[PDB]
Paper text:
The proteins MakA/B/E can form a tripartite toxin that lyses erythrocytes and is cytotoxic to cultured human cells. Here, we identify the proteins from the five V. cholerae genes, vca0880 through vca0884, that are coexpressed from the operon makDCBAE and analyze the crystal structures of MakA, MakB, and MakE. For structural analyses, MakA, MakB, and MakE were crystallized in their soluble, compact forms in which the hydrophobic β-tongue is hidden in the interface between their respective head and tail domain. Each protein is predicted to undergo a conformational change in which the head domain is unfolded and rearranged into two long helices in order to assemble into a membrane-bound tripartite complex.
MakB has the same overall fold as MakA and MakE but deviates more from MakA, with an r.m.s.d of 3.0 Å calculated on 328 Cα atoms. The MakB tail domain is very similar to that of MakA; differences are mainly found in the head domain in which MakB comprises a larger β-sheet (strand order β1β3β2β4β5) than MakA. One MakB molecule is found in the asymmetric unit in which we also modeled two sulfate ions. MakB has two additional cysteines, Cys87 and Cys103, which form a disulfide bond that rigidifies the connection between the carboxyl terminus of α2 with the N terminus of α3. In MakB, the program detected a stretch with increased hydrophobicity, residues 194 through 228; however, a transmembrane helix was not suggested. In MakB, the hydrophobic region constitutes most of β2 and all of β3. The pore form of AhlC was used to model MakB and generated a structure in which the tip of the protein has one more hydrophobic side and one more polar side. On the other hand, because MakB is less hydrophobic, it is considered to not bind the membrane directly. Next, MakB binds to the membrane-anchored MakA and arranges itself as a scaffold for the pore-like complex. We hypothesize that the first step, the conformational shift and subsequent membrane attachment of MakA, is the most critical. Both unbound and membrane-bound MakA appear to attract MakB, which would undergo a similar conformational change and interact with MakA but not directly with the membrane.
Residue numbers in the entry: 0 to 354
């Protein structure tokens, strides 16, 4: 236990930070790109969904108003500590008085308390937005449930259409790249492209018309998003079975099934990126661990322990290398990601690029 965290541990946690904040931004983009058409006077349940999705849109836009500041603070926290820590580490043990060691280590103490405070405050932003999103998603679930209850005759047809839509989304998501610290460190470049699925519905069993459009981000390496989506057999298979399943249902029941599947996807991504993949709690405990070790060392040298026998000080120049490696990483993930050309998936069964 040096004055440093385990490096592999810290990088994987920073990778989670970097995928989570990317996920939040893309989720926000998904919320603000959601489009629902008309032709066919809106049923009551769709009037309700339009309003309640708008609330969810507002909740995530409010969070985005703070996300840049929150992300910047995380990056700065690691840049500031490594710089301060590197200044301590240079102290040649030969000519560095114990009073000097105490001084520079107390500057570490000051920064760590800063870092802990700003991390906890950011975590409160997450919990505020998470609870807001959950309440909004509960209103969405009620509306679509009431809509399905107005169509009990077609309930099992709607369940099948919704399931295939969830499967189709999963089949595309399963083509995404695995983002790890090892691969970011090794220079791998991840491409972030938005994939729009345009869900049509059949009118009077005769003509397909647009109903809803929904976009989400897909990460690839090397090849574009279109290259792998257009090449996946599972995707085209899911598209063909969805078309046949939509022939068993009213235009309105088709719409209610699409809407329920999209509501479920929105709810899972908020649960994912605003709570489960929220790594701020683990970030605070990292700083806390370091404060405990620095205060123990400060207490030790103040109270008369012999400095050259305290292992935290014997290894200070190795902990500095760890912090440098960590700071090199946060600067890497601070870059703008690479945006690829978007992909359109239309449920008249075609895959287009640049669209």
């Amino acid at each position: 236990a040096m004055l440093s965290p385990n490096v592999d541990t810290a990088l994987n946690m920073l990778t989670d930070v970097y995928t989570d904040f990317l996920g939040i931004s893309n989720y926000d983009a998904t919320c603000n790109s959601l489009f629902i058409g008309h032709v066919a006077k809106d049923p009551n349940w769709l009037v309700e969904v339009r309003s309640r999705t708008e609330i969810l849109r507002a909740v995530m836009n409010e969070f985005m108003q703070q996300k840049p500041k929150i992300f910047a603070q995380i990056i700065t926290s690691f840049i500031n500590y490594q710089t301060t820590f590197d200044a301590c580490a240079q102290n040649s043990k030969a000519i560095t008085s114990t009073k000097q060691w105490i001084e520079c280590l107390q500057l570490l103490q000051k920064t760590l308390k800063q870092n802990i405070t700003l991390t906890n405050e950011a975590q409160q932003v997450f919990t505020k937005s998470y609870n807001q999103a959950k309440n909004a998603e509960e209103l969405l679930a009620s509306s679509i449930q009431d809509g399905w209850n107005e169509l009990a005759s077609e309930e099992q047809a709607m369940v099948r259409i919704a399931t295939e839509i969830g499967s189709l989304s999963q089949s595309i998501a399963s083509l995404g790249a695995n983002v790890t610290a090892a691969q970011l460190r090794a220079g791998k470049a991840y491409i972030q492209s938005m994939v729009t699925i345009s869900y049509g519905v059949v009118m009077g069993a005769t003509t397909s018309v647009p109903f809803l459009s929904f976009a989400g981000a897909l990460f690839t390496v090397g090849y574009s998003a279109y290259s792998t989506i257009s090449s996946a057999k599972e995707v085209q298979q899911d598209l063909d079975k969805l078309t046949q399943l939509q022939t068993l249902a009213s235009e309105e029941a088709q719409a209610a099934a699409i809407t329920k599947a999209i509501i479920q996807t929105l709810s899972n991504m908020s649960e994912e990126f605003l709570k489960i993949d929220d790594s701020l709690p683990a970030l605070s405990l990292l700083w806390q661990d370091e404060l405990d070790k620095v205060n123990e060392l400060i207490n030790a040298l103040q109270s008369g322990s012999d400095p050259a026998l305290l292992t935290d000080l014997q290894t200070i120049k190795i902990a500095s290398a760890s912090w440098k490696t960590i700071s090199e990483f946060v600067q890497l993930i601070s870059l703008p990601p690479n945006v690829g050309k978007p992909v359109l998936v239309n449920t008249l069964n075609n895959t287009i690029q640049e669209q």
